[PDB]
PDB file of C-alpha atoms in Angstrom:
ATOM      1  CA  UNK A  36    -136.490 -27.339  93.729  1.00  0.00           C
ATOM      2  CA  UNK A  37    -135.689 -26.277  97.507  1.00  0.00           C
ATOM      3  CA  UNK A  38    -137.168 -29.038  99.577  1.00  0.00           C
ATOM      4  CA  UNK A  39    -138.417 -28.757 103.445  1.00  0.00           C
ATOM      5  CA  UNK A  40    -137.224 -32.023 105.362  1.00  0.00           C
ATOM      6  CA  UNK A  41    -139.607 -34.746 105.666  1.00  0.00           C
ATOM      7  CA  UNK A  42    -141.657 -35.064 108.731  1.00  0.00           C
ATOM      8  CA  UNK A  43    -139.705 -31.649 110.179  1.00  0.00           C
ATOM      9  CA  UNK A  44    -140.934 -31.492 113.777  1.00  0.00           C
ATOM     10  CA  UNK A  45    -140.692 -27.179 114.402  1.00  0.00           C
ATOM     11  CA  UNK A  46    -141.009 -27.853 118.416  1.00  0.00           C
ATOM     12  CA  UNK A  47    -138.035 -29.581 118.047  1.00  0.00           C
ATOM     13  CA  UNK A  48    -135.398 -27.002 116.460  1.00  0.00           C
ATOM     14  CA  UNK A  49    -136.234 -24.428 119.136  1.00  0.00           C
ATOM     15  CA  UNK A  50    -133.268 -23.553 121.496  1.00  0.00           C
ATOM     16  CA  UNK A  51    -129.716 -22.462 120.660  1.00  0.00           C
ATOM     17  CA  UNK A  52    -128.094 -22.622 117.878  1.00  0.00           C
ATOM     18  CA  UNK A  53    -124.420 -21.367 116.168  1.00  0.00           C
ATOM     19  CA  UNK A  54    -123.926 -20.834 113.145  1.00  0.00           C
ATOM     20  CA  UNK A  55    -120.578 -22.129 111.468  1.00  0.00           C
ATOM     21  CA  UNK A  56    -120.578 -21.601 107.565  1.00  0.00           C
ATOM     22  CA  UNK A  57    -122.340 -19.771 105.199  1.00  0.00           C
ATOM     23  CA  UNK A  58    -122.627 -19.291 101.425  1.00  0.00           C
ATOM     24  CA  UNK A  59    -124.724 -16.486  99.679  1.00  0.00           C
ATOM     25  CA  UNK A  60    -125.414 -15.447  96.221  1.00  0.00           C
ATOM     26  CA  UNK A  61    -126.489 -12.160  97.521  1.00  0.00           C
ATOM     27  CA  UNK A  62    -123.567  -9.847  96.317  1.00  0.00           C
ATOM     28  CA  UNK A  63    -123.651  -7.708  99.467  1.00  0.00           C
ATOM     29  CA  UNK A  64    -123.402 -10.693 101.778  1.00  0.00           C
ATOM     30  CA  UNK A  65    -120.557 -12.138  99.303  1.00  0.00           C
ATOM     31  CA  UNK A  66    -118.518  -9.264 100.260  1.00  0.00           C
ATOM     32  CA  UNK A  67    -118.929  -9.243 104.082  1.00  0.00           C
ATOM     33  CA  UNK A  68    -119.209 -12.810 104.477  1.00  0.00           C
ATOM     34  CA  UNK A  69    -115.125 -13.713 105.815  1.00  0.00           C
ATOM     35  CA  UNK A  70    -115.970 -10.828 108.339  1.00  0.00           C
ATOM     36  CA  UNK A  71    -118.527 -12.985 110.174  1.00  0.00           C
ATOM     37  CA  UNK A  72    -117.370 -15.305 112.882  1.00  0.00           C
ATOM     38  CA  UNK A  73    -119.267 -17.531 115.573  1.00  0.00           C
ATOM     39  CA  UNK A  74    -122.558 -16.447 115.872  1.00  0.00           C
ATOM     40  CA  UNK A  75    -125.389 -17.668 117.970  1.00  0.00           C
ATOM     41  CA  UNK A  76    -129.413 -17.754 117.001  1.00  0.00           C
ATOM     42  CA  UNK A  77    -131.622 -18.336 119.531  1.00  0.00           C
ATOM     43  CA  UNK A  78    -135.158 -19.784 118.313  1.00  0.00           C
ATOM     44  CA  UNK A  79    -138.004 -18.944 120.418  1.00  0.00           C
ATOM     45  CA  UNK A  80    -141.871 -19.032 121.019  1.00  0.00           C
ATOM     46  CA  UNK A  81    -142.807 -15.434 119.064  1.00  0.00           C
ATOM     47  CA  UNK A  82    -145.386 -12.683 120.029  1.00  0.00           C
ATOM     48  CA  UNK A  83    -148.487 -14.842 118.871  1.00  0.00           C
ATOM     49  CA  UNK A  84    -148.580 -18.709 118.318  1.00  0.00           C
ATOM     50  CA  UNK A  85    -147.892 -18.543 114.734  1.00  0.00           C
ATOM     51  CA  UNK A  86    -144.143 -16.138 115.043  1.00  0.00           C
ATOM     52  CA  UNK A  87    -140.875 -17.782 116.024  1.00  0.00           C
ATOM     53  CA  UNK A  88    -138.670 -15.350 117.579  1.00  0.00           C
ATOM     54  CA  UNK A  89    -135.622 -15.159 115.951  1.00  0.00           C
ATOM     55  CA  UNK A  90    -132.481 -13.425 118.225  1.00  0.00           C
ATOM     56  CA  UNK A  91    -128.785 -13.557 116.572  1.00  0.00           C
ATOM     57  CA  UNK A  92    -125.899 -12.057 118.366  1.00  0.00           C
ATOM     58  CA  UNK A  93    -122.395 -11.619 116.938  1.00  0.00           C
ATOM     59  CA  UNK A  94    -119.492  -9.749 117.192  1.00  0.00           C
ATOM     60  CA  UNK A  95    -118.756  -6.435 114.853  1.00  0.00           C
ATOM     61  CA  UNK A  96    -116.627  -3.890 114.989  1.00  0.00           C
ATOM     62  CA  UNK A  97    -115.913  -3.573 118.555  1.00  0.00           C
ATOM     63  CA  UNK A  98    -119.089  -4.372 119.990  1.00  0.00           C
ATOM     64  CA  UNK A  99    -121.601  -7.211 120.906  1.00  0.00           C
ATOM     65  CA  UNK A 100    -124.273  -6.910 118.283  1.00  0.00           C
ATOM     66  CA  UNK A 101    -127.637  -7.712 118.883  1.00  0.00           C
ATOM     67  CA  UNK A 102    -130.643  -8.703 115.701  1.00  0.00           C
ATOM     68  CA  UNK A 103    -134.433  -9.805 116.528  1.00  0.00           C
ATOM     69  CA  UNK A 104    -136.604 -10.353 114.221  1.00  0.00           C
ATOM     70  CA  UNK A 105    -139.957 -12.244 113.966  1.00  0.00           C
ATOM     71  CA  UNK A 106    -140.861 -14.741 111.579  1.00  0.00           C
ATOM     72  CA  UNK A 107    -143.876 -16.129 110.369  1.00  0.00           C
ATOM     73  CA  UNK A 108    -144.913 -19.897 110.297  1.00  0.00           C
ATOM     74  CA  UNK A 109    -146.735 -20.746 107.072  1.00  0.00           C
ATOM     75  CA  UNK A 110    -148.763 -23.021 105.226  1.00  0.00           C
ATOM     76  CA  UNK A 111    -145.493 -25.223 105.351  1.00  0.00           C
ATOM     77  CA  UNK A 112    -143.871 -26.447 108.225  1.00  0.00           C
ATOM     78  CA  UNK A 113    -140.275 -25.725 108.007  1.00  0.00           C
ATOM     79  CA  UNK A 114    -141.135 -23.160 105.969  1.00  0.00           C
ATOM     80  CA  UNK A 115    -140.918 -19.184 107.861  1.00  0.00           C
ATOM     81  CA  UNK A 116    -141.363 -15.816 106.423  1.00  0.00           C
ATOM     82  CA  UNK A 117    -139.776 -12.369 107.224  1.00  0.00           C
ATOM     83  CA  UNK A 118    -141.369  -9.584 105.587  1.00  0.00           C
ATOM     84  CA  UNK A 119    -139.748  -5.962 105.874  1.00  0.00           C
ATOM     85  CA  UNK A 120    -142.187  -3.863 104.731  1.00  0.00           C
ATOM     86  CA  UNK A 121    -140.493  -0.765 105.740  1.00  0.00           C
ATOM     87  CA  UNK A 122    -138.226  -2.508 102.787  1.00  0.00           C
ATOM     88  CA  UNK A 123    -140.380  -4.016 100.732  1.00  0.00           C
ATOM     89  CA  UNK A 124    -138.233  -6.747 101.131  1.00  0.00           C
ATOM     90  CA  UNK A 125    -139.364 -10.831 101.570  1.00  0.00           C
ATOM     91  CA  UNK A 126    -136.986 -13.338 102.558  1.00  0.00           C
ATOM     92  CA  UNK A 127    -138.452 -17.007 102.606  1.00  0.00           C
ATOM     93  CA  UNK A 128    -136.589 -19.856 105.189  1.00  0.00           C
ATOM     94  CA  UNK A 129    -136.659 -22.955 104.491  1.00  0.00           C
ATOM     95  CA  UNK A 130    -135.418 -25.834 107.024  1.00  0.00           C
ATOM     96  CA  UNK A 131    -133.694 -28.287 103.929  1.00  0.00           C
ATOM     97  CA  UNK A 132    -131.742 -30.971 106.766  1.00  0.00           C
ATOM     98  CA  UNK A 133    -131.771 -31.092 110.536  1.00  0.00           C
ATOM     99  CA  UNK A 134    -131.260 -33.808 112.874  1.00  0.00           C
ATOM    100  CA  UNK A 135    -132.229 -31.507 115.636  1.00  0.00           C
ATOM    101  CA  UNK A 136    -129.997 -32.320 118.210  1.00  0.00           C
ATOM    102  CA  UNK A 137    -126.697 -31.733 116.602  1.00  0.00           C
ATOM    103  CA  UNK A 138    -127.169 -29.859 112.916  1.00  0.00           C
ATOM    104  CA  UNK A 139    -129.648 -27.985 110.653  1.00  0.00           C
ATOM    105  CA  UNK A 140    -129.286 -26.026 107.433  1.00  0.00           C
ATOM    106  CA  UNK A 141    -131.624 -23.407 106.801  1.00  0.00           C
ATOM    107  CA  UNK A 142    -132.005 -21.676 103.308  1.00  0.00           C
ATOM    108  CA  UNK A 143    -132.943 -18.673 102.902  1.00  0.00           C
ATOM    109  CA  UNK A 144    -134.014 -16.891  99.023  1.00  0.00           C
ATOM    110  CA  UNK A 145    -134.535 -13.224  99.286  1.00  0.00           C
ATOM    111  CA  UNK A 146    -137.063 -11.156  97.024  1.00  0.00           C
ATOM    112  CA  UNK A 147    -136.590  -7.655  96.417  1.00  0.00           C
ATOM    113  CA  UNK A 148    -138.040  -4.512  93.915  1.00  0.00           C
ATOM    114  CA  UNK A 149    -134.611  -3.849  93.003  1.00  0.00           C
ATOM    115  CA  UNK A 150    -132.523  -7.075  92.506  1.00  0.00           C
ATOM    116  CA  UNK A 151    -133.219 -10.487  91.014  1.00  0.00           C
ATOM    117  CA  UNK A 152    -133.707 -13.014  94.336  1.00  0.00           C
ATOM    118  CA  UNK A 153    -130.634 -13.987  96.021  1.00  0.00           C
ATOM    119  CA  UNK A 154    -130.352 -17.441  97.827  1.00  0.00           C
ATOM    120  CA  UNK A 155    -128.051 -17.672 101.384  1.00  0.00           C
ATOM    121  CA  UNK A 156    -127.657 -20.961 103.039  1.00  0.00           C
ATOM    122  CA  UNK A 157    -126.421 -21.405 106.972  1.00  0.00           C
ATOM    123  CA  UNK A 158    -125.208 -23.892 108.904  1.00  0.00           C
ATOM    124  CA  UNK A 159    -125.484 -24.395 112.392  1.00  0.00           C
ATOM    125  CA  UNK A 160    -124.411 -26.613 114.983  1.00  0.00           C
ATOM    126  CA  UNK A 161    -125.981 -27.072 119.020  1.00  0.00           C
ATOM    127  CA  UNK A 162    -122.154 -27.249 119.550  1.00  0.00           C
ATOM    128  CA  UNK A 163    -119.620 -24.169 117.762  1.00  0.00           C
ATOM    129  CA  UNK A 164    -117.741 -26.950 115.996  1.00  0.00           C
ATOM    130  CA  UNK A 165    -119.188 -30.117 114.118  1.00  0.00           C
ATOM    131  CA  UNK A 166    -117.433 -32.909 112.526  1.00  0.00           C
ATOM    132  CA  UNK A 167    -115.710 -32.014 108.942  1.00  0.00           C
ATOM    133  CA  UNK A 168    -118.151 -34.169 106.860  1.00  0.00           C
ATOM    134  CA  UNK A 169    -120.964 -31.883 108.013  1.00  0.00           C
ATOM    135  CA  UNK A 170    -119.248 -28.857 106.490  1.00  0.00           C
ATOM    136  CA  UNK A 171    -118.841 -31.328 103.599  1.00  0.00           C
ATOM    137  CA  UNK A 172    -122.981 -32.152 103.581  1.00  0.00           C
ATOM    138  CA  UNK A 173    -123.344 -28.130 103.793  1.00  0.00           C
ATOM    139  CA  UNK A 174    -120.881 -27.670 101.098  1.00  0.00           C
ATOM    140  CA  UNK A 175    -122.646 -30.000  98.561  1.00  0.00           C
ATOM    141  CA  UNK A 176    -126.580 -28.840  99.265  1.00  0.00           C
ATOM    142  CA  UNK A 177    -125.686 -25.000  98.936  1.00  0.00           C
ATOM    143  CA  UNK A 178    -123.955 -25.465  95.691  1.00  0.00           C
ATOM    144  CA  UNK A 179    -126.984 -27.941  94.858  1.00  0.00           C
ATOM    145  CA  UNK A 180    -129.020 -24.691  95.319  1.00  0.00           C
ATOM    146  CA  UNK A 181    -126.603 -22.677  92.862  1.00  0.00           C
ATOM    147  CA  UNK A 182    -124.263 -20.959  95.710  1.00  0.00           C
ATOM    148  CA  UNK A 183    -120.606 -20.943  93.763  1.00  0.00           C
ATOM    149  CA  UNK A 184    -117.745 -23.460  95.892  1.00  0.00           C
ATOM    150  CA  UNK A 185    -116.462 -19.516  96.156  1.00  0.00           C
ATOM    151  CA  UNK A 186    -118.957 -17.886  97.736  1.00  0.00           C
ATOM    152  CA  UNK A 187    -119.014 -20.673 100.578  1.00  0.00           C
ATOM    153  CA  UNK A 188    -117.313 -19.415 103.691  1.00  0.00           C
ATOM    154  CA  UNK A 189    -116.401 -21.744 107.264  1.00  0.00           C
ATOM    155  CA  UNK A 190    -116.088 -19.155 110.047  1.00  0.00           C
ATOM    156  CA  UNK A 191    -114.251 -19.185 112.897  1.00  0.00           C
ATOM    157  CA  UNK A 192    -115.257 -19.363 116.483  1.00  0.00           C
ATOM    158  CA  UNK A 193    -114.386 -15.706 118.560  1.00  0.00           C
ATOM    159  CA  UNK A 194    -116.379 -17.612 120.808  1.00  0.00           C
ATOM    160  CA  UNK A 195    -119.725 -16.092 122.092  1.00  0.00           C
ATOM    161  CA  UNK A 196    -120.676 -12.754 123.520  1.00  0.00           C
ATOM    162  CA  UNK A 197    -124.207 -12.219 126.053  1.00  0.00           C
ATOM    163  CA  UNK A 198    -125.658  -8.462 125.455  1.00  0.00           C
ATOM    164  CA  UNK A 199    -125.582  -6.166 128.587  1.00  0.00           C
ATOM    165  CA  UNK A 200    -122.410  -8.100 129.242  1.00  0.00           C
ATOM    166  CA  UNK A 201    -120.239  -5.553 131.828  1.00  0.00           C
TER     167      UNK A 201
END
Protein backbone atom coordinates (compact mmCIF):
# COMPACT_ATOMS: atom_id res chain seq x y z
CA UNK A 1 0.00 0.00 0.00
CA UNK A 2 3.01 2.60 -0.47
CA UNK A 3 1.34 5.96 -0.50
CA UNK A 4 2.76 9.35 -2.26
CA UNK A 5 2.11 12.38 0.22
CA UNK A 6 -0.89 14.36 -0.32
CA UNK A 7 -0.71 17.48 -2.30
CA UNK A 8 3.40 16.75 -2.75
CA UNK A 9 4.61 19.96 -4.38
CA UNK A 10 8.00 18.36 -6.62
CA UNK A 11 9.34 22.19 -7.11
CA UNK A 12 9.57 22.22 -3.65
CA UNK A 13 11.98 19.17 -2.64
CA UNK A 14 14.61 20.36 -5.12
CA UNK A 15 17.96 21.47 -3.49
CA UNK A 16 20.21 19.63 -1.03
CA UNK A 17 19.61 17.05 0.81
CA UNK A 18 21.60 14.37 3.42
CA UNK A 19 20.75 11.43 3.99
CA UNK A 20 20.84 10.07 7.71
CA UNK A 21 19.28 6.46 8.00
CA UNK A 22 18.43 3.83 5.90
CA UNK A 23 16.75 0.41 5.96
CA UNK A 24 16.69 -2.11 2.96
CA UNK A 25 15.33 -5.46 2.33
CA UNK A 26 17.64 -5.77 -0.53
CA UNK A 27 20.21 -8.41 0.81
CA UNK A 28 23.18 -6.73 -0.89
CA UNK A 29 22.40 -3.33 0.60
CA UNK A 30 21.72 -5.23 4.10
CA UNK A 31 25.26 -6.14 4.08
CA UNK A 32 26.93 -2.80 3.17
CA UNK A 33 24.53 -0.68 4.81
CA UNK A 34 26.76 0.23 8.48
CA UNK A 35 29.52 1.13 5.85
CA UNK A 36 27.57 4.18 4.63
CA UNK A 37 27.93 7.44 6.45
CA UNK A 38 26.71 11.14 5.69
CA UNK A 39 25.83 11.42 2.33
CA UNK A 40 24.50 14.28 0.35
CA UNK A 41 21.80 14.16 -2.79
CA UNK A 42 21.46 16.97 -4.67
CA UNK A 43 17.97 17.22 -6.63
CA UNK A 44 18.05 19.09 -9.75
CA UNK A 45 16.20 20.28 -12.99
CA UNK A 46 17.20 17.01 -15.43
CA UNK A 47 18.18 16.93 -19.20
CA UNK A 48 14.46 17.50 -20.42
CA UNK A 49 11.49 18.92 -18.31
CA UNK A 50 10.21 15.65 -17.31
CA UNK A 51 14.03 14.12 -15.56
CA UNK A 52 15.14 15.22 -12.11
CA UNK A 53 18.76 15.01 -11.83
CA UNK A 54 19.73 13.02 -9.18
CA UNK A 55 23.72 13.61 -7.86
CA UNK A 56 24.81 11.65 -4.49
CA UNK A 57 28.27 11.98 -3.18
CA UNK A 58 29.75 9.96 -0.31
CA UNK A 59 32.72 8.79 1.04
CA UNK A 60 34.24 5.05 0.19
CA UNK A 61 37.19 3.58 0.55
CA UNK A 62 39.54 6.37 0.44
CA UNK A 63 37.99 8.52 -1.96
CA UNK A 64 35.15 11.10 -2.63
CA UNK A 65 32.63 9.14 -4.61
CA UNK A 66 30.56 10.60 -7.05
CA UNK A 67 26.71 8.85 -8.53
CA UNK A 68 24.32 10.72 -11.19
CA UNK A 69 21.64 9.36 -12.34
CA UNK A 70 18.42 10.62 -14.05
CA UNK A 71 15.05 9.93 -13.09
CA UNK A 72 11.88 10.06 -14.65
CA UNK A 73 8.71 12.00 -13.45
CA UNK A 74 5.56 9.95 -14.02
CA UNK A 75 2.01 9.80 -14.19
CA UNK A 76 2.32 10.44 -10.31
CA UNK A 77 3.76 13.23 -8.73
CA UNK A 78 6.08 12.10 -6.12
CA UNK A 79 6.38 9.25 -7.92
CA UNK A 80 10.15 8.90 -10.18
CA UNK A 81 11.51 6.11 -12.16
CA UNK A 82 15.12 4.86 -12.84
CA UNK A 83 15.37 2.37 -15.42
CA UNK A 84 18.86 0.59 -16.09
CA UNK A 85 18.43 -1.01 -19.08
CA UNK A 86 21.96 -1.93 -19.51
CA UNK A 87 20.53 -3.99 -16.25
CA UNK A 88 17.33 -4.67 -16.91
CA UNK A 89 16.81 -3.35 -13.71
CA UNK A 90 13.62 -0.81 -12.49
CA UNK A 91 13.66 0.86 -9.31
CA UNK A 92 10.39 2.93 -8.54
CA UNK A 93 10.70 6.22 -5.84
CA UNK A 94 8.20 7.14 -4.11
CA UNK A 95 8.14 10.51 -1.90
CA UNK A 96 5.86 8.76 1.32
CA UNK A 97 6.47 12.17 3.97
CA UNK A 98 8.22 15.47 3.45
CA UNK A 99 7.78 18.71 5.01
CA UNK A 100 10.19 20.13 2.55
CA UNK A 101 12.10 22.36 4.45
CA UNK A 102 13.49 20.15 7.10
CA UNK A 103 12.71 16.15 6.24
CA UNK A 104 11.55 13.71 3.51
CA UNK A 105 11.50 9.94 3.22
CA UNK A 106 11.73 8.51 -0.04
CA UNK A 107 11.00 4.73 -0.78
CA UNK A 108 12.35 3.08 -3.13
CA UNK A 109 11.09 -0.94 -4.41
CA UNK A 110 13.45 -2.41 -6.87
CA UNK A 111 12.40 -4.93 -9.74
CA UNK A 112 14.76 -7.23 -11.16
CA UNK A 113 14.90 -10.67 -13.70
CA UNK A 114 16.75 -12.34 -11.09
CA UNK A 115 15.42 -11.54 -7.54
CA UNK A 116 11.97 -11.05 -6.04
CA UNK A 117 11.61 -6.89 -5.56
CA UNK A 118 13.42 -5.48 -2.74
CA UNK A 119 12.10 -2.30 -0.90
CA UNK A 120 14.92 0.48 0.60
CA UNK A 121 13.69 3.44 2.47
CA UNK A 122 15.98 6.82 3.15
CA UNK A 123 15.88 9.49 5.21
CA UNK A 124 17.10 12.77 4.74
CA UNK A 125 17.43 15.90 6.45
CA UNK A 126 18.25 19.84 4.81
CA UNK A 127 20.45 19.75 7.99
CA UNK A 128 23.05 16.30 8.68
CA UNK A 129 21.28 15.83 12.00
CA UNK A 130 17.41 15.99 12.80
CA UNK A 131 15.66 15.69 16.00
CA UNK A 132 15.44 11.90 17.47
CA UNK A 133 11.63 11.56 16.93
CA UNK A 134 12.25 11.90 13.19
CA UNK A 135 14.50 8.84 13.19
CA UNK A 136 11.60 7.49 15.30
CA UNK A 137 8.80 8.56 12.33
CA UNK A 138 11.47 6.85 9.81
CA UNK A 139 11.78 3.91 12.00
CA UNK A 140 7.99 3.15 12.18
CA UNK A 141 7.02 3.84 8.19
CA UNK A 142 9.97 1.55 6.89
CA UNK A 143 8.99 -1.30 9.06
CA UNK A 144 5.25 -0.31 8.02
CA UNK A 145 6.61 -1.16 4.50
CA UNK A 146 8.08 -4.64 5.77
CA UNK A 147 11.92 -3.42 6.35
CA UNK A 148 12.94 -5.70 9.66
CA UNK A 149 13.80 -3.12 13.07
CA UNK A 150 17.32 -5.02 11.95
CA UNK A 151 17.87 -4.05 8.77
CA UNK A 152 17.33 -0.25 9.82
CA UNK A 153 20.63 1.54 10.08
CA UNK A 154 21.28 5.58 11.57
CA UNK A 155 24.59 6.66 10.02
CA UNK A 156 26.96 8.82 11.13
CA UNK A 157 28.06 12.15 9.86
CA UNK A 158 32.05 12.02 8.29
CA UNK A 159 30.78 15.20 7.35
CA UNK A 160 30.65 16.12 3.57
CA UNK A 161 33.13 15.88 0.76
CA UNK A 162 32.84 18.38 -2.83
CA UNK A 163 34.34 16.28 -5.98
CA UNK A 164 37.49 17.84 -7.62
CA UNK A 165 38.20 18.82 -4.05
CA UNK A 166 42.38 19.44 -4.02
Amino acid sequence: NIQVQENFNISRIYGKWYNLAIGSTCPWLKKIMDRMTVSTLVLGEGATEAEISMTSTRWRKGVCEETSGAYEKTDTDGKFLYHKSKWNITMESYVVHTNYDEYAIFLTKKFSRHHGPTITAKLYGRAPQLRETLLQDFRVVAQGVGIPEDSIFTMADRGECVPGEQ
